[PDB]
């Protein structure tokens, strides 16, 4: 069974700029674009995880998407952390890809929120965080996450604590993790790199993010601060992509360079 849901997709306008600003200064995103939207959603969820239920949907352009709804209410600012994290990863990955150090390209799945609405008057408008909370609360529902459907053989490549999948090693992913820390000047590290690999393309989902600032990604269970960053680097070996990029090493690195895998 499936029915129509109408409402608003909420994204961040000018994401590149806002992320670049969020990263350089210390100031949260305070700008959210609403776009009226209508999908067909299944009634029965086809999967659950620890925290939420997963429904198949079609978005109107005909794309296969997944709608995710949480088991019980979570406040907006928590859901927003997942979105802010995803937009950091996409922003980092786009830059990294553009370096053209590797024939493999990284794509984190887009995440946005959706809220059901009888009305379309916020369509095309940018709202503040407070205004977004009021539009969510007018609904009295926790918003859903929406992301493109991903099929294929799913693999966890690097966890958020120094573990490495050895038989599915790709040097592009390890150099990416290392580089995220270089590009953000030691502030953060992207790991929990996992998803699907097809035709030189990694479709990646649910990454973790370690931040040196305790006050920064406060809800994430997978953020392990400076300790997480150290854990990654203890087992990290700079590979031919790290070398090609001249990545300076974290001081916790002890192991010698390796030259297996890409390039
Ligand atoms: N394309 C997709 N995007 C998101 N989730 C998907 C997708 N395809 C399948 N799923 C299913 O969603 C399940 C649970 O979703 P997940 O996001 O992990 O929920 P939880 O956050 O509670 O762990 C996954 O194990 C998988 O079975
Ligand atoms: Zn390295």
């Amino acid at each position: 069974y499936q029915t129509q849901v109408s409402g608003y997709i909420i994204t961040v306008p000018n994401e590149t700029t806002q992320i670049r600003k969020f990263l350089a200064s210390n100031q949260r995103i305070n700008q959210f674009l609403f776009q009226h939207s209508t999908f067909r959603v299944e009634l029965a969820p086809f999967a659950k995880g620890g925290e939420r239920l997963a429904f198949r949907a079609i978005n109107g352009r005909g794309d296969r998407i997944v709608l995710k709804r949480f088991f019980q209410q979570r406040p907006l600012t928590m859901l927003l952390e997942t979105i802010e994290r995803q937009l950091i990863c996409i922003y980092l990955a786009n830059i990294f890809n553009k370096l053209n150090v590797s024939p493999n390209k990284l794509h984190f799945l887009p995440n946005y929120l959706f809220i059901p609405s009888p009305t379309k008057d916020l369509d095309g408008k940018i709202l503040t965080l407070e205004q977004t909370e009021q539009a969510v609360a007018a609904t009295c529902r926790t918003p859903n996450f929406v992301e493109p459907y991903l099929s294929g053989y799913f693999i966890k490549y690097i966890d958020n604590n120094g573990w490495i999948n050895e038989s599915e090693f790709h040097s592009t992913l390890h150099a990416f993790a290392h580089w995220t820390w270089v590009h953000t000047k030691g502030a953060l590290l992207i790991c929990d790199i996992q998803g699907v690999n097809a035709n030189n393309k990694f479709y990646l989902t649910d990454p973790a993010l370690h931040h040196i600032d305790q006050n920064k990604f406060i809800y994430s269970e997978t953020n392990l601060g400076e300790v997480g960053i150290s854990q990654f680097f203890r087992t990290h070996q700079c590979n031919a992509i790290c070398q090609g990029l001249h990545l300076p090493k974290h001081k916790e690195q002890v192991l010698p360079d390796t030259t297996k895998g890409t390039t």
Side-chain angles (χ1 to χ4, degrees), residues 1-60 62-263:
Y1 293 140
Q2 23 155 111
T3 189
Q4 297 296 118
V5 293
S6 279
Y8 294 112
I9 284 314
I10 288 149
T11 63
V12 179
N14 309 322
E15 44 181 73
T16 310
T17 316
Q18 286 277 87
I19 288 322
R20 199 172 56 241
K21 292 213 215 166
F22 181 31
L23 282 180
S25 79
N26 204 318
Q27 280 187 14
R28 311 285 299 281
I29 287 175
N30 195 31
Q31 279 184 20
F32 303 95
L33 176 75
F34 282 52
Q35 287 176 297
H36 177 263
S37 167
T38 309
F39 337 111
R40 223 148 76 186
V41 192
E42 271 160 29
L43 263 315
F46 70 105
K48 42 181 269 94
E51 43 254 295
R52 52 209 203 266
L53 232 46
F55 297 75
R56 282 183 292 248
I58 341 283
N59 73 351
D63 314 311
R64 285 176 291 211
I65 59 176
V66 173
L67 249 75
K68 286 166 215 210
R69 104 156 145 257
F70 268 101
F71 301 147
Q72 74 277 64
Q73 62 174 7
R74 306 277 183 97
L76 189 67
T77 49
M78 184 195 129
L79 317 182
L80 285 181
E81 258 184 37
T82 304
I83 298 311
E84 295 169 295
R85 171 167 70 249
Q86 201 76 176
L87 290 176
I88 296 172
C89 297
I90 293 164
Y91 165 89
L92 294 189
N94 292 352
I95 292 171
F96 178 93
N97 284 351
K98 282 201 209 158
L99 301 174
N100 211 57
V101 287
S102 175
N104 298 135
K105 303 302 187 186
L106 288 56
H107 301 272
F108 291 85
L109 299 186
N111 278 10
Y112 33 97
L113 298 188
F114 171 80
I115 65 171
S117 182
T119 171
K120 27 212 278 303
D121 62 84
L122 308 164
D123 192 23
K125 293 167 182 353
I126 307 183
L127 272 53
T128 65
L129 183 16
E130 179 40 42
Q131 292 169 339
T132 309
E133 298 265 17
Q134 304 166 23
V136 167
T139 266
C140 14
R141 297 199 187 297
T142 300
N144 310 294
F145 286 102
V146 194
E147 62 180 20
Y149 183 79
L150 173 68
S151 44
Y153 182 46
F154 191 99
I155 319 227
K156 193 156 191 135
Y157 298 101
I158 287 156
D159 76 354
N160 68 323
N161 188 44
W163 173 97
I164 299 180
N165 181 333
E166 285 276 355
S167 83
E168 216 75 46
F169 182 92
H170 294 276
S171 76
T172 305
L173 299 174
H174 291 79
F176 174 74
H178 183 175
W179 171 89
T180 63
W181 176 83
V182 170
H183 193 268
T184 60
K185 315 170 161 93
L188 62 77
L189 181 132
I190 305 307
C191 52
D192 256 348
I193 282 136
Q194 50 189 334
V196 168
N197 171 21
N199 333 123
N200 290 21
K201 287 173 66 198
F202 291 87
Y203 299 102
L204 301 172
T205 189
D206 261 290
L209 187 154
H210 299 309
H211 209 292
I212 65 179
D213 169 5
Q214 276 100 357
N215 287 118
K216 204 81 204 264
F217 278 91
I218 197 81
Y219 285 114
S220 300
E221 265 221 28
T222 63
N223 167 21
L224 305 175
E226 66 169 285
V227 163
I229 283 158
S230 308
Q231 286 285 91
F232 171 80
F233 275 112
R234 286 174 186 131
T235 60
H236 173 59
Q237 287 190 268
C238 281
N239 60 50
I241 307 320
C242 300
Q243 298 180 340
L245 283 156
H246 307 296
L247 308 186
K249 301 197 178 176
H250 184 285
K251 290 176 177 52
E252 279 305 282
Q253 276 180 245
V254 287
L255 300 180
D257 303 359
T258 225
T259 47
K260 71 183 179 200
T262 299
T263 292

